[PDB]
Amino acid sequence: LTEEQIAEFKEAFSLFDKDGDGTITTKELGTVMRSLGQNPTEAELQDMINEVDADGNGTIDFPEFLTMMARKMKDTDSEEEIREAFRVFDKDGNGYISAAELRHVMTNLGEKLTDEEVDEMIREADIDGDGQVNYEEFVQMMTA
Amino acid sequence: GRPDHCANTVKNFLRKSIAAQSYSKMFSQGTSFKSLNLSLEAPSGARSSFRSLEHLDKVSRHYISEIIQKVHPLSSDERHLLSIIINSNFNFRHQSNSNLSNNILNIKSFDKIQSENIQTHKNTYSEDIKEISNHDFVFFGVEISNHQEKLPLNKTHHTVDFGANAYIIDHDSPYGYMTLTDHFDNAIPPVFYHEHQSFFLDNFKEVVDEVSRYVHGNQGKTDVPIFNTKDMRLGIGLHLIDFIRKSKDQGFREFCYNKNIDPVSLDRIINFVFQLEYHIPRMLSTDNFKKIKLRDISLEDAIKASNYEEINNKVTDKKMAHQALAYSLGNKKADIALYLLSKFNFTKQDVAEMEKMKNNRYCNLYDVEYLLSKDGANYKVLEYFINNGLVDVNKKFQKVNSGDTMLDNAMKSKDSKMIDFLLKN
Amino acid sequence: DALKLCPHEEFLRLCKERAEEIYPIKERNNRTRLALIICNTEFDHLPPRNGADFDITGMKELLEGLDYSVDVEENLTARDMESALRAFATRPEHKSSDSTFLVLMSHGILEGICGTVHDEKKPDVLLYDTIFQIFNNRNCLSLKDKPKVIIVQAARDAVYKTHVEKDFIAFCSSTPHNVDSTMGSIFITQLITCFQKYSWCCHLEEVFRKVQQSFETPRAKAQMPTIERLSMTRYFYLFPGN
């Protein structure tokens, strides 16, 4: 949920306050965000800049930046969401998905990808070699 | 909210798991990491959790903090260059002599190729595979992309030409990692080994003797910086500005601090000061790629890369097929050799003419029977040569290890299959 | 082609005027010069050595251009190397010969060269002292008072010896396992070229010195080849083409 010692954002922020003001310019927001590996769109940038004081000429302080980064970090998909996404395709309710079922899902749904890639990720889902994929167990194993 | 969205989350999760396996291998089987306090425990079960990925993010944060504290106050020109590099996208280049692309480009890692061949035994592990264990990653050189010059701007990585065919992608991988040099070799060579040395020699001065320097973290030498895909650009830019501040050549400084710096110039600078290396976990298979043939390849390089297209183009006469089969046996490419043996019908007089080949390295140095018996990989072709009566089993070598027979090479390689075959025949 | 030949009249003049200062040369007619190359490329418990085939071919072609008949042995254990050197020393063609070359190429330690079945827990090494013993003036009468040149490429009381180990020279390279080219070695390549362009006018040790000068660059000074166990008392002009 909440942030913890990810206040290292400040470091990135501090690399971009020209003055000691601790204030970055609106024009730089995207840049600083890309310094943290985030790729905001122009719509998101405008929405964030309008939330921050519009009157002030390119004045964003680190409190406002951290408040925006809080939502940006809290919008990452959770473990239970991934489990629900798995359950969407197992209407059997058994807790398992056939390897061919997942293959058909990945070939004829979602973003398109090469067949060798679907083979590799089916191998990753099919641990034992059997048609079953224990999605609950697998996602719990992956989430430490 | 659509079903496509859930399938997308599923496949993103599985790609994350593949990357987690790769990074767990790297961080648990890497001996150099333990000395640097960056090592990680082995996976408890059959697979590894996302803890390898969080460990990757942690070591990336560590190196970012190390380089940020080195220069916490930033000047205007420094921050302008940092913004230029933060907003610039990369092209990633993999060079090989093999044909890795048809309608789709599929590049696999070393470990994936090993697992696919399913050879029974594991040969002695090389030092790199042991010290870094990055062998489940496809490797790439890095160039700037916002240019309209010829696509392969740089053709050498660690002054090595890894192949004539250059495959270039233009998108970052979400789970790749960047190093400022090779993950094995943390040293940049002198200027006489750099490809684009002419530009820097003509226009810049003291950087020539300043550029060849170990690029390492504050822990000391052999501390190779690791950056994840999210933090790579910042780390590159900060290490670059550290080097630029250390440099005394004002011309180089104001060239790399030109507000309207040229993208190709920036690529020249980053290929000069650093030798960036990008790693994508396990495989790389996409439809968005560019293939450039930089040069023609030799028949032997083609045999080594199993490039059947160049082989068929170059091997048209039996005199050339002699060279091809010699290079196949010498380089232990048995499948290529069997392809040649089916496409061209070889007789005993052909092997006699191969024995007289002084142009070819293997056949001028070694007896053909020696070449057949050197390694177990050639068993099949050995079988072909013996069942078809092309060579006599008891023939005594006359070139290298004279007086020995093929049984002796079999006993050296300790391959019981070859020994039984030679004994019964 | 690349090997420059010494003119015959110079050969006669140098043999006549400085005979007390150079090793004598047997006539090309009825001469049986022999050279041996032992090279280990594949190891059971050690990394492989690649590009060795290029060095073998180059050394073979050079020694043959110098009119030596070359025997080449590959992938031998230490005991088999010792037996091969011992057999070569009892080769009787050396009676009709005037010199010999031994090129040994493998991984090594400070005390000797490594065999194929070598491990730190059970070592398999041929000691250099063993080599110099096998060819001394007592155990190899065919090559007594004749120059004995040992080229070594490795990777990573006793006064009796000083009386019987005569007319030896060793040129040793100790470049590490991986530093370069998979299509050769810088030491073997530099040696071959210096022989090809300086053997016609300069004696063996002058050629070795020119190799060393070629290694005098700041990036190659670390892996400079060394002249060791020099038991020579005269100069060996190889007089190529004669």
Swiss-Prot record, chain A:
Region Necessary and sufficient for interaction with PCP4: start-end pairs: 73-144
List of residues that carry N6-acetyllysine: 18, 91
Post-translation changes: Ubiquitination results in a strongly decreased activity. Phosphorylation results in a decreased activity.
InterPro entries: CALM/Myosin/TropC-like (IPR050230), EF-hand-dom_pair (IPR011992), EF_Hand_1_Ca_BS (IPR018247), EF_hand_dom (IPR002048)
Domain EF-hand span(s) in chain numbering: 4-39, 40-75, 77-112, 113-144
PROSITE patterns cross-referenced by the UniProt entry: EF_HAND_1 (PS00018), EF_HAND_2 (PS50222)
Residues carrying Phosphotyrosine: 96, 135
Residues reported to bind Ca(2+) 4: 126, 128, 130, 132, 137
Modified residues (Phosphothreonine): 41, 107
Sites where the protein binds Ca(2+) 3: 90, 92, 94, 96, 101
SMART domains hit by this protein: EFh
Chain residues that bind Ca(2+) 2: 53, 55, 57, 59, 64
Stated family: Belongs to the calmodulin family.
Domain free text: The N-terminal and C-terminal lobes of CALM bind to the C-terminus of KCNQ1 in a clamp-like conformation. Binding of CALM C-terminus to KCNQ1 is calcium-independent but is essential for assembly of the structure. Binding of CALM N-terminus to KCNQ1 is calcium-dependent and regulates electrophysiological activity of the channel. The C-lobe interacts with KCNN4 channels in a calcium-independent manner, whereas the N-lobe interacts with the S4-S5 linker of KCNN4 in a calcium-dependent manner playing a role as calcium sensor and gating the channel.
Name of the featured protein: Calmodulin-1
Organism of origin: Homo sapiens
UniProtKB/Swiss-Prot annotation, chain B:
List of residues binding NAD(+): 94-96, 106, 108, 120, 123-124
Top-level EC class: lyase
Effect upon mutating residue 92 to A: Abolished arginine ADP-riboxanation of host CASP4/CASP11
ANK repeats: 320-349, 364-395, 402-425
Disruption phenotype: Host cells display increased pyroptosis.
Keyword set includes Glycosyltransferase: no
Regulation: Interaction with host calmodulin (CALM1, CALM2 and/or CALM3) is required to mediate arginine ADP-riboxanation of host caspases.
GO biological process, one term: symbiont-mediated suppression of host calcium-mediated signal transduction
Effect of residue 412 to A: Strongly reduced interaction with host CASP4/CASP11
Consequence recorded when altering residue 47 to A: Abolished interaction with host calmodulin
Keyword set, alphabetical order: ANK repeat, Host cytoplasm, Lyase, NAD, Plasmid, Repeat, Secreted, Toxin, Virulence
Molecular functions per Gene Ontology: ADP-riboxanase activity; calmodulin binding; toxin activity
Active site residues of this protein: 277
Site (Important for catalytic activity): 94, 139, 162, 182
UniProt effect for mutating residue 300 to A: Strongly reduced interaction with host CASP4/CASP11 and subsequent ADP-riboxanation of CASP4/CASP11
UniProt-annotated location(s): Secreted; Host cytoplasm
Outcome after substituting residue 234 to A: Abolished interaction with host calmodulin
EC number, UniProt record: 4.3.99.-
Main subcellular localisation: secreted
Gene Ontology CC: extracellular region; host cell cytoplasm
UniProt record similarity statement: Belongs to the OspC family.
Described function: ADP-riboxanase effector that inhibits host cell pyroptosis. Acts by mediating arginine ADP-riboxanation of host CASP4/CASP11, blocking CASP4/CASP11 autoprocessing. This prevents CASP4 activation and ability to recognize and cleave GSDMD, thereby inhibiting LPS-induced pyroptosis. ADP-riboxanation takes place in two steps: OspC3 first catalyzes ADP-ribosylation of target Arg, and then initiates a deamination to remove one N-omega group.
Assembly, per entry: Interacts with host calmodulin (CALM1, CALM2 and/or CALM3); specifically interacts with the apo form of calmodulin, preventing calcium-binding.
Protein name: Arginine ADP-riboxanase OspC3
Protein's organism: Shigella flexneri
The organism's taxonomic lineage, starting at the top: Bacteria, Pseudomonadati, Pseudomonadota, Gammaproteobacteria, Enterobacterales
Curated annotation (Swiss-Prot), chain C:
Subcellular compartments: Cytoplasm, Cytosol; Endoplasmic reticulum membrane; Mitochondrion; Inflammasome
Record flagged with keyword Cytoplasm: yes
Annotated site (Cleavage): 157-158
Reactions this protein catalyses: Strict requirement for Asp at the P1 position. It has a preferred cleavage sequence of Tyr-Val-Ala-Asp-|- but also cleaves at Asp-Glu-Val-Asp-|-
Species annotation: Homo sapiens
Enzyme class label: hydrolase
Protein family: Belongs to the peptidase C14A family.
Annotated consequence of substituting residue 161 to A: Strongly decreased ability to cleave IL18
Alphabetic keyword roster: Acetylation, Cytoplasm, Endoplasmic reticulum, Hydrolase, Immunity, Inflammasome, Inflammatory response, Innate immunity, Membrane, Mitochondrion, Necrosis, Phosphoprotein, Protease, Secreted, Thiol protease, Zymogen
Membrane topology summary: Peripheral membrane protein
Activity regulation, per record: Activated by homooligomerization induced by direct binding to cytosolic LPS, in a TLR4-independent manner. In addition to LPS, CASP4/CASP11 may also be activated by oxidized phospholipid 1-palmitoyl-2-arachidonoyl- sn-glycero-3-phosphorylcholine, an oxidized phospholipid (oxPAPC), in dendritic cells, promoting adaptive immunity. The role of oxPAPC is however unclear and another report suggests that oxPAPC competes with LPS-binding and inhibits the non-canonical inflammasome in macrophages.
EC number: 3.4.22.57
GO cellular component terms listed in the entry, alphabetical order: cytoplasm; cytosol; endoplasmic reticulum; endoplasmic reticulum membrane; extracellular region; mitochondrion; NLRP1 inflammasome complex; non-canonical inflammasome complex
Outcome of mutating residue 49 to A: Abolished ability to cleave IL18
Written domain comment of the UniProt record: The CARD domain mediates LPS recognition and homooligomerization.
Superkingdom of origin organism: Eukaryota
Annotated tissue distribution: Widely expressed, including in keratinocytes and colonic and small intestinal epithelial cells (at protein level). Not detected in brain.
GO MF term set: CARD domain binding; cysteine-type endopeptidase activity; lipid binding; lipopolysaccharide binding
Name of the protein described by the UniProt record: Caspase-4
Active-site residues, as the UniProt record annotates them: 107, 155
Lineage of the species this protein comes from: Eukaryota, Metazoa, Chordata, Craniata, Vertebrata
UniProt keyword Mitochondrion, yes or no: yes
